[PDB]
Design a protein around this ligand. Structure first.
Ligand SMILES: CCC(CC)(c1ccc(OC[C@@H](O)C(C)(C)C)c(C)c1)c1cc(C)c(C(=O)Nc2nnn[nH]2)s1
Length: 251
């Protein structure tokens, strides 16, 4: 097969959008409220909810990340042709899934952590539980990160996957499903063609089907995250540890 001029333009736009919305040096992380790691009885749920020591830092990180996702989405070919109602629905419903995809670049299989520079910005299972989450979310999240890392995606495939994730016509509340489907089909066809033309074997074997499966896995992680966020919101005064953007997107 062959990538058309339009498909190559779409790829060039998305790579550029990524380069403009992802900092591989994590230079802004020092501006977030500082990470706090204290004694909590070996990860006791009770003391983790009493302290929520990692919540202001990780809420700042997710809020920064939603801002970058918004910036990326604005550059997706066709996204600005949608109504403001469809843009909000797509952005709110995909935000945590795109964050999970984005975070894979800093994820390392050496020690199963997200290494964003200094050991202060090295995140593990323990840090997520220190923000109030339980193993029902962080165990399959780690499983997803490893699974995605083993795909060894080209940057072109990585940007196309995040773009396909955002522009999903099957999100609850979407009005113009037909226009969203036409945008995603253009992106999905660009991806299938890219894999056939540029991805060499063995890595290319059933890669499109594996990428689509990661999108289904992301929906299940989104529902679990949404359940965990509701339980965290029952904790008195925890909203003051969040941000207006995080409260709007997840509330
Ligand atoms: C995806 C995993 C992880 C692990 C620390 C994460 C953070 C907060 C989390 O929960 C907190 C939320 O539930 C609240 C309550 C809404 C705040 C959860 C469940 C996971 C992130 C790691 C990195 C590097 C991320 C990021 O954003 N990477 C980026 N962005 N830009 N450049 N690098 S996110």
């Amino acid at each position: 097969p062959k990538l058309s001029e339009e498909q190559q333009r779409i790829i060039a736009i998305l790579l550029d959008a990524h380069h403009k919305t992802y900092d591989p040096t994590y230079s802004d992380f020092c501006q977030f409220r500082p990470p706090v790691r204290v004694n909590d009885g070996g990860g006791s749920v009770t003391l983790e909810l009493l302290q929520l020591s990692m919540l202001p830092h990780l809420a700042d990180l997710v809020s920064y990340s939603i801002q970058k996702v918004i910036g990326f989405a604005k550059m997706i070919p066709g996204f600005r042709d949608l109504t403001s109602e469809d843009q909000i629905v797509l952005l709110k419903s995909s935000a945590i899934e795109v964050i999970m995809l984005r975070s894979n670049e800093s994820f390392t299989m050496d020690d199963m952590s997200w290494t964003c520079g200094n050991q202060d910005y090295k995140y593990r299972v323990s840090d997520v539980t220190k923000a109030g989450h339980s193993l029902e979310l962080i165990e399959p999240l780690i499983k997803f990160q490893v699974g995605l890392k083993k795909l060894n995606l080209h940057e072109e495939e990585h940007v196309l996957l995040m773009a396909i994730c955002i522009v999903s016509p099957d999100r609850p509340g979407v009005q113009d499903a037909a226009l969203i489907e036409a945008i995603q089909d253009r992106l999905s066809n660009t991806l299938q063609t890219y894999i056939r033309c540029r991805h060499p074997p063995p890595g290319s074997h059933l890669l499109y089907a594996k990428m689509i499966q990661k999108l289904a896995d992301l929906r299940s992680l989104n529902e679990e995250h949404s359940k965990q966020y509701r339980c965290l919101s029952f904790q008195p005064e925890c909203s003051m540890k969040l941000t207006p953007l995080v409260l709007e997107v997840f509330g």
